[PDB]
C-alpha cells in the first residue's frame, strides 16, 4: 500500500464528528504549549497577545494500518480527522492558526497536530516590568466533552524568539478540572503558567 | 448503538433549516448569559465590549434516541442542527464566537449550546465610574420568529467573571420582554439582561 | 403540509440564481433604512460608520403555496432564495450583516429580508458639530440589474439608540436613477439623506 | 427560452478553470479603472488606499445563446464563470470587493464584470500637497497567463467628498518580462495624478 | 488535446492531499523569495511587515502530457494540486496571499506557484537606521514533512519597490534544517537573510 491508499483508507474510516472512544474509555489528549513570542502586553487592561505551538496528541485506533511494507506515517488535513474541541477559557480572541492545518497520523492510530497559534488572553500582567515578572495563566480544555469522554494531560525558552522585548523566566503546565454550578460533570483542563518579564 | 450510530441518525433526521415546532406550539428557547469579561467601556460613546457564555437550550424531539444501551449525550456541530436565530437588538458588532461551535444533544432531544461570545453593544454606560455603577441593558431574541413560533425565557453573577477585568459586576438581572415593530401586530420575545457594573 | 414540506418545496422550486421576473416586468424591490446607531464620524476624511436595518421586500410568485391548511409564513436562509444584488454606491466597506441571514417568505410569494448592517460611507460630514447638522446621502440600488429587470422604490428616530452621541434631525428616502456614460441602461436607486448632529451643543 | 433556461445552460456549459481561447488566439481582456475615492495617503511611506470600479470585459463564445425570442443578457455569479486572474503588481493589500460578485453575460458570449475594489498600493506619493500633485502608477495584468494566453488592453464618478481631487488619469498598455523566462505578461499601467484640495 | 483536456487529466490524476513522492525519494521543492516591499519596521518590537514573491517549484511527473501538438503549460487552481505545506517559522501573522491562487503545470510535470505574500515577522531589526543596516532572517520549510519526504533547496533589488522608505543591501538564501528535541526527524528549510536599511 502507498500513501494514496493510506489516505483513501483514512477517508473511508475517519469520522471527523465522532470522538474515537475505545471501551467507553475517555480519549486521552496530551496538550503542551511551546511559547514562540509575546507580542503585546497591556498592564492596565491585563491583556497579552502571544504566539505558541500547541502540541496536541491522541490515539484514533480506527485509523491504524499495517506498515510492515508501507509508510508508517502520513500528513492528513485536520478536516478529514476527529480533532479535540480544545478552547482556552480566558481567550479574548479566536485562535489565529498561522501554519498549514495538517496532522500526522502514525500507522498505530496515534495523531499529532502542532498548530502555531496567535491568540489574545485576559490574564495577570501585573509585575511584567519587574525582575520577578508577571505570571499569566492560560487554561485549555475540552469545551463540550467532560472527563468521561476526554481527559487532558500535560507533558522553556528553547523555541522562544531571541528578538522579543520579553523573556521567559519559567513555564509550568499543571492538570486541573472545572465543574459548573449547574451540572455534576467535570471538564478537564491544562493550566499553563507563563512567568515572563520585559528584558532589562 | 454507539456514538457513530447516534450521529448518523442525527444526520438522517435533523433539518437545520426547519424550526422543530411540536403541534402548533412555539419552540421554548431558554437563554441565560454568564459574564466572563468586560474589556472596554466608553462613557462618551456609550459602548461596551464584553465576553459572555450564552447558555441556550431547547428541545428538538425529532433527534431523540433509545439510550438504554447507548450513550445518552453526544457533541454535534451546530451546522447539523436547527439553532434559534437569536440576535442582540443593541449589538454594534457581529457576535465573535470564541469556542468550538458544538452543541450537546441529549437522547430525549434536549439541545444545549453554550458559545463564548465577544461582542460590542450600545447601552447606558452613565455612572460606570461611580459606586452605584452603570446599568447596561442587552436585549436578545429571535430576529425572524414571532412569539407563536419561538418563545424566549430566562433562567452568583460574578462566579465566572475575570478577576483581571478593570471592572466588577454589582448585579445581573435577566427578565422576559417583548418587542413589537411599528408596521405589524406580531410580537418578538426577548430576554432583557441588565448588567450593573462599575470600574474597580 | 408542515413547515418541513414548505421548505422542501421552496428548495425544489426556488432558483437563487434567477431573477423572478413575471411577464416582462421588472421585479419591484422595496428598500427602506431604519438608522440604529452612528458609531464613528470623521469630518476631515468625510467618513461615517453606521448601523441600520435594511428593510427589503419583493415578490417571487414561484415560491407561493396553498396555506388554507398549512403555515402561511416560514423563515428561510437567504442562500435558498433569489435576493436582489443591492449595493450602496458610496460604501467604502463591505456590508457587515450583524443578524441571522434569514428571510420571511409568505404563502403568496412575498419575501421580507431585514438584515442589520454595519457599513462605512464616503459622504458629506461637514456641519455635524453645528445646529443644522451634516447631511450624509447613501445611494442603494441593484449593482447589475437595470430598471427593466429591477425597480427600486422607497416607502425617523423610532429605532435610533437613545445612547448615541448623535441625534437624527431628519431622514428622507427618494427614488432616483443612475445611467453610465458608456451604456443605455438606467439603474434605479433609493437616495437616503441622513441629517444628524452631535447632541448637547452650546 | 426564459432566464432560468439561459442560466441553467450557462451553469451546464461554463468551465471556470479553463481560459476560453478561440483558435490559437489570446483571450482579449479589456480593463479600465474608474476612481471613486482616495481615502488615505502617506507621503512618508508612499502608500495610498483607493476605491475604484475595475471595468473588465472579455468573450467566452461557449456561453452564447440565440436571443431572437429570449433575454439578450443575464447576471451570473463569477464563481460560475472563468474570470481573468488579474492582479495589481504594486498592491500591498488583497483587493477588497465591496459589491455583489456578479458578472453580466451577453447572448454573444461577451462577459462584463465591474467590481468596486478598495485596495492599498505602494506608489509615488511625492508632491501630493503641491499644485502639480503626486502621480501614483498602478500596474494590473494577468498573474499567471503570458501574452499568448491573455492580452490586456485599456473624475466623472470620483467622490466630491474626498479630501483629494483628480488632476488626470492615463491608462497605457504595457508588458512585464521576468529575468527568468522568455514569456511577456501584458498589463495596463494606470497613472493617477491627484492632489490634496 | 486542448487546455480543457489537459486540466481534466490533471483533475482526474492529481491527489491534492498526497505528497507525489517517486520511489522512496523526497519531493525536491525549490523556494526563492523576491522582496517587493518593506512596509513597516519596528526597532523596539523587532517586527517587520514585508511583501515578497515566494517562487515555489516541484515536480509531479504523474501530471505530464505530450505537448508536440498541444499547449505545454496551463494555469491550475492550487486546490486541484498537491502543494508543499510551507510555513515561515518566525512569522507572527498569517500569510496574506495578494494574488490569484493559480499554479502553472508544465507538460513535463513541473509545477510553479508564485504567490505574492504580505506577512509580519519577528527578526533582528537592530541597525536599520545605520549604513550597514539590519539583517532580518526568515526561515521557510515544510511544517509537517521531514527531510525524507520533502527537501527544500534555494536557487536582489530587481523587483524591490523604488518607493519603499527602505532599500536592500543584500539577500542571501541558504539551505538549513531544524530538528525537534522530541524526535530524530530533520525538517529542511531555506534561511533568507534580508540585509536592508532606511534610505
Ligand atoms: O514535535 C514535532 N514537530 C514540531 C514541533 C514544533 C514545531 C514544528 N514541528 C513540526 C511538526 C511535526 C508534526 C506536525 Cl503534525 N506538525 C508540525 C515532531 F518532531 F514530532 F514532528
Ligand atoms: O452548562 C454547562 N457547561 C458549561 C457552562 C459554561 C461554560 C462551559 N460549559 C461547558 C459546556 C457544556 C456543554 C456545551 Cl454544549 N457547551 C459547553 C454544563 F454543565 F451543562 F455542561
Ligand atoms: O419589519 C419587521 N420586522 C423587523 C423590523 C426591524 C427589525 C427587526 N424586525 C424583525 C424581523 C422580522 C422578519 C424579518 Cl425577515 N427580519 C426581521 C416585521 F415586523 F414586519 F416583520
Ligand atoms: O461601469 C459600469 N456599470 C456600473 C458602475 C457602477 C455601478 C453599477 N454599474 C452597472 C453594472 C453593470 C454591469 C455589471 Cl457586470 N456591473 C455593474 C458599466 F456599465 F460601464 F459597466
Ligand atoms: O517567474 C515567472 N513569473 C513570475 C515571477 C514573479 C511574479 C510574477 N510572475 C508571473 C507568474 C508566472 C507563473 C506563476 Cl505560477 N505565477 C506567476 C515566470 F515567468 F516564470 F512565469
Shortest distance between the Cα of C2 and any Cα of chain D, in A, equals 28
Closest residue on chain D to C124 (Cα): D161
Single out the residue of B173, B172, B171, B180 nearest to residue B141, CA to CA: B180
What are the backbone dihedrals phi and psi of residue E130, each rounded to the nearest 5 degrees, phi first?
-110, 170
Q: Which three cell numbers stand for residue B17?
A: 433549516
List of residues 6+ apart from E57 with CB closer than 8 A: E29, E30, E110, E111, E112, E113
**Residue B175 has which C-alpha cell?**
427578565
Residue E59 sits at φ, ψ, to 5 deg, of -115, 140
Touch D-A: 3+ C-beta pairs under 8 A: no
Confirm if A154 and A175 have CB atoms less than 8 A apart.
Answer: yes
CA angle at C128 for the pair C127 and C132, rounded to the nearest 5°: 60
Cβ neighbourhood burial of B78 (10 Å; 0-12, 13-18, 19+): middle
Are B111 and B104 spatial neighbours (Cβ–Cβ below 8 Å)? yes
**Ligand 3 within 6 A of CB of B186:** yes
Provide the grid cell at B191. Answer: 430576554
- Residues A116 and A97: beta-carbon distance below 8 Å: yes
Q: Mutation test of the interface with chain C: which of D12, D75, D113, choosing the one with the most C Cβ atoms within 10 A?
A: D75
Integer Rg of chain B from CA: 19
- H-run or E-run covering E32: strand E27-42
* Cell (9 digits) for E188: 529542511
Q: D with E: how many residue pairs have Cβ under 8 Å apart?
A: 67
Of C192, C182, C194, residue with least CA distance to C146:
C182
- Torsions phi, psi for B4 (to 5 deg): -55, -50
CA–CA separation, C128 and A58 (whole Å)? 59
User: Residue B143, SS3?
Assistant: coil
Which of B1, B57, B98 has the highest number of chain A CBs within 10 A, making it the mutation to test binding with A?
B98
Q: In a 10 Å sphere around its CB, with 0-12 CB exposed, 13-18 middle and 19+ buried, how is residue D154 labelled?
A: middle
The reply to whether residue C100 touches residue B143, judged by beta carbons under 8 angstroms, is: yes
Please state, in angstroms and rounded to a whole number, the distance separating the CA atoms of residues D104 and B71.
54
Q: Say which ligand is closest to the CA of C56.
A: 3
Ramachandran quadrant class, E45 (left: phi over 0; alpha: psi -120 to 50; beta: rest): alpha
Name the helix (H) or strand (E) containing C3.
Answer: helix C3-13
The three grid cell numbers given for residue D114, joined into one nine-digit string: 465591474
Of the ligands numbered here, which is closest to the C-alpha atom of A74? 1
The answer to whether C165 contacts B46, with C-beta atoms less than 8 Å apart, is yes
In 3D space, the residue among D151, A31, D85 whose CA is nearest the CA of residue E75 turns out to be D85
D38 touches chain C (CB under 8 A): no
Q: What was the resolution (in A) of this experimentally determined structure?
A: 2.0
Please say whether the dihedral angle defined by the alpha carbons of residues E102, E107, E111 and E113, taken in this order, is positive or negative.
Answer: negative
Residues linked to residue C35 through DSSP beta bridges, in sequence order: C52
Query: Residue A183: CB within 6 Å of ligand 2?
Result: yes
- DSSP state for residue C132 in the 8-state scheme: S
Q: Which ligand is nearest to the CA of B181?
A: 3
Length of chain C measured in residues: 202
Note the helical H segments in chain A: 3-13
Domain range for residue B149?
Answer: 3-199
CA–CA dist B126, B171 (Å, integer): 16
Chains sharing 3 or more CB pairs under 8 A with chain D? C, E
CB-based contact (8 Å) between D78 and chain E? no
First-to-last C-alpha distance (Å) of chain C: 63
Provide, as residue numbers in chain B, all residues whose Cβ is less than 8 Å from the Cβ of A87. 98-100, 116
Q: Whose CA is nearest to atom 14 of ligand 5?
A: D144
B46–C76 CB contact, under 8 Å: no
Under 8 Å CB pairs connecting chains C and D tally to 66
Smallest Cβ distance to B122: which of C7, C77, C163? C163
Residues sharing a CB contact under 8 Å with residue D174, sequence separation 6 or more, in sequence order: D139, D186, D187, D188, D189
Residue with CA nearest ligand 4 atom 12 = C144
- Distance (Å, rounded) from C-alpha B82 to C-alpha B91? 23
Experimental approach taken: X-ray
What is the C-alpha separation between C200 and C34, in angstroms, rounded?
A: 23
Tell me the sheet residues that pair with E172: E193
**What distance in angstroms lies between residue D116's CA and the mean position of ligand 4's atoms?**
9
Q: Give the ligand with the smallest distance to the CA of C86.
A: 4
- Helix H, strand E, coil C: the string for C58-84 is EECHHHCCCCCCCCCEEEEEHHHCCCC
The answer for residues whose C-beta is within 8 angstroms of residue A95's C-beta and 6 or more apart is A88, A115, A117, A118, A119
Bridge partners (DSSP) listed for residue C66? none
Written as nine digits, the cell of C115 is 438584515
Q: Are B73 and B109 in contact (CB under 8 A)?
A: no
C-alpha of residue C116 to centroid of ligand 3, in Å:
10
Whether A47 has its CB under 8 Å from any CB of chain B: the answer is yes
* Cα angle: C54, vertex C58, C61; to 5 degrees: 155
Give C26's DSSP letter.
P
* C-alpha D189 to ligand 4 mean position (Å): 22
CB of B181 closer than 6 A to ligand 3?
Answer: yes
* DSSP letter assigned to residue D79: G
Total domains in chain C come to: 1
- Contacts with A102 from chain E: Cβ below 8 Å: 85, 143-144
CB–CB contacts below 8 A, A to E: 64
Do E161 and D15 count as a contact with CB atoms less than 8 A apart? Answer: no
**φ and ψ of E192, to 5 deg:** -100, 115
* Residue B100 in contact with partner chain A when CB distance is under 8 A: yes
Distance from Cα A55 to the centre of ligand 1, integer Å: 8
Torsion of CA C32, C33, C34, C38, to 10 degrees: -170
Which positions in chain C touch D103 (Cβ < 8 Å)? 144
Residue D66, exposed/middle/buried by CB under 10 A (0-12, 13-18, 19+)? exposed
Q: Do A118 and E93 make contact, defined as CB atoms within 8 angstroms?
A: yes
Residues whose CB is less than 8 angstroms from the CB of residue E90 and which lie 6 or more positions away in sequence, other chains included: A161, E121, E122, E123, E137, E138, E139
Q: In angstroms, what separates the C-alpha of B157 from chain C's closest C-alpha? A: 25
For residue C48, the Cα-to-chain-centroid distance in whole angstroms is: 18
For A22, the grid coordinates are 475505545
Q: Is the CB of B104 under 6 A from ligand 2?
A: yes
Looking at ligand 2, which residue's alpha carbon is closest to its atom 5?
A180
* Ligand 2, atom nearest to A182 Cα: 19
Give D154's strand partners: none
Dist. CA D125–CA D193, nearest whole Å: 10
Q: Cell digits for A42?
A: 497591556
Largest CA distance in chain C: 63
The set of residues, in sequence order, having a beta carbon less than 8 Å from that of B33 and lying 6+ positions away, is B52, B53, B54, B55, B138, B140, B172, B174, B193
Task: State the SS3 of A121-134.
Answer: EECCCCCCCCCCCE
DSSP 8-class letter at B91: B
- Put simply, the answer to whether C164 touches B46 (Cβ < 8 Å) is yes
> Across-strand partners of D91?
D121
Chain D interface mutation, best of E163, E164, E167, highest count of D Cβ atoms under 10 Å: E163
Contact criterion met (CB < 8 Å) for A158 and E143? no
- What CATH code is carried by the domain that includes residue E119? 2.70.170.10
Count CB neighbours of D163 within 10 A: 14
> Which residues, at least 6 apart from E181, have a Cβ–Cβ distance to it below 8 Å?
A158
E57 close contact with D: CB closer than 8 A? no
Q: What share of chain D is helix, strand, coil (3-state, %, to 5)?
A: 10, 50, 45
Question: Distance between CA A85 and CA B100 in Å, rounded?
Answer: 6
| CA–CA distances in Å: residue A116 to residues A78, B116, B194, E50 | 14, 22, 39, 20
Residue with cell 483571450: D27
Task: Say if E158 is an interface residue toward chain D (CB within 8 Å).
Answer: yes
Distance CA A71, CA A2 (A): 7
Q: Are D143 and E97 inside 8 Å of each other by CB?
A: no
Q: Where are the alpha helices (DSSP H) in chain E?
A: 3-13
d(CA B7, CA B89): 34
Judged by a CB distance cut-off of 8 A, whether residue B15 touches chain C is yes
Residue A94: closest CA among B51, C11, C20: B51
Phi/psi for A3 (5° steps) reads -60, -40
Amino acid at each position: 500500500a502507498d500513501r494514496a491508499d493510506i489516505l483513501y483508507n483514512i477517508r473511508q474510516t475517519s469520522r471527523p464528528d465522532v470522538i474515537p472512544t475505545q471501551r467507553d474509555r475517555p480519549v486521552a489528549v496530551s496538550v503542551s504549549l511551546k511559547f514562540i513570542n509575546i507580542l503585546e502586553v497591556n498592564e492596565i487592561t491585563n491583556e497579552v497577545d502571544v504566539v505558541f505551538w500547541q502540541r496536541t496528541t491522541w490515539s484514533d485506533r480506527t485509523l491504524a494500518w499495517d506498515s510492515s511494507h508501507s509508510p508508517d506515517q502520513v500528513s492528513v488535513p485536520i478536516s478529514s480527522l476527529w480533532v479535540p474541541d480544545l478552547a482556552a477559557y480566558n481567550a479574548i480572541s479566536k485562535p489565529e492558526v498561522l501554519t498549514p492545518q495538517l496532522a500526522r497520523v502514525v500507522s498505530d492510530g496515534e495523531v499529532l497536530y502542532v498548530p502555531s497559534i496567535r491568540q489574545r488572553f485576559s490574564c495577570d500582567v501585573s509585575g511584567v516590568d519587574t525582575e520577578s515578572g508577571a505570571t499569566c495563566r492560560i487554561k485549555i480544555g475540552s469545551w463540550t466533552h467532560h472527563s468521561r469522554e476526554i481527559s487532558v494531560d500535560p507533558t522553556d525558552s528553547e523555541y522562544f524568539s531571541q528578538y522579543s522585548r520579553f523573556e521567559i523566566l519559567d513555564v509550568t503546565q499543571k492538570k486541573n478540572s472545572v465543574t459548573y454550578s449547574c451540572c455534576p460533570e467535570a471538564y478537564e483542563d491544562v493550566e499553563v503558567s507563563l512567568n515572563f518579564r520585559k528584558k532589562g
